[PDB]
Amino acid sequence: FTLIELMIVVAIIGILAAIAIPQYQNYVARSEGASALATINPLKTTVEESLSRGIAGSKIKIGTTASTATET
Amino acid sequence: FTLIELMIVVAIIGILAAIAIPQYQNYVARSEGASALATINPLKTTVEESLSRGIAGSKIKIGTTASTATET
């Protein structure tokens, strides 16, 4: 092992560092907003259809309970 | 043993000395800086990933304790 060998390794370590890391939280925030909008968008169909069929607005709830003829 | 033998030995001892020693603390300092940067560089990934997944910034600590769903 020579000192030139180790100094070249140190220089290449420094060069391999310093790689600029761009902003990434904006991408995550935008994806979260898109996911939320895509999650709550189909619920417009449920509310509108239930209101069209006469189901009371107070009877339109959120859950996995089996919807009856009066509750959705 | 002759005096010329010993004087040649003394002269070669003096010649074998006087070898200039260049600066070396700069190399050690540069290697230490590179090692520190390479040590703390991967911690950027941990912090960014934990913040992306919603883990609170105050919950991102340093240690070998097993990270839970809320602490990293």
The CA-CA distance between the termini of chain A, in Å, is: 76 Å
Radius of gyration of chain A: 29 Å
Total number of strands of chain A: 0
Percent in helix of chain A: 55-70%
Give the topology string of chain A: H per helix, E per strand: HHH
Strand residue content of chain A: under 5%
Gross morphology of chain A is rod-shaped
Number of helices of chain A: 3
Q: What profile does the largest beta sheet of chain A have?
A: none
User: Oligomeric form of this entry?
Assistant: part of a larger assembly
Family (chains A, B): Belongs to the N-Me-Phe pilin family.
Protein name (chains A, B): Pilin
Subcellular location (chains A, B): Fimbrium
Main location (chains A, B): other
3D structure, described in words:
The structure is cut from a larger assembly and holds 2 copies of chain A (72 residues). Chain A has helices at 3-16, 25-40, 43-52. With 72 residues, chain A is mostly helical. Chains A and B meet through α1 of A and α2 and α3 of B.
What is the compact description of this entry?
Chains A, B: One of its GO terms (biological process) is cell adhesion. The structure is cut from a larger assembly and holds 2 copies of chain A (72 residues). The first copy, chain A, has 72 residues and is an all-alpha fold.
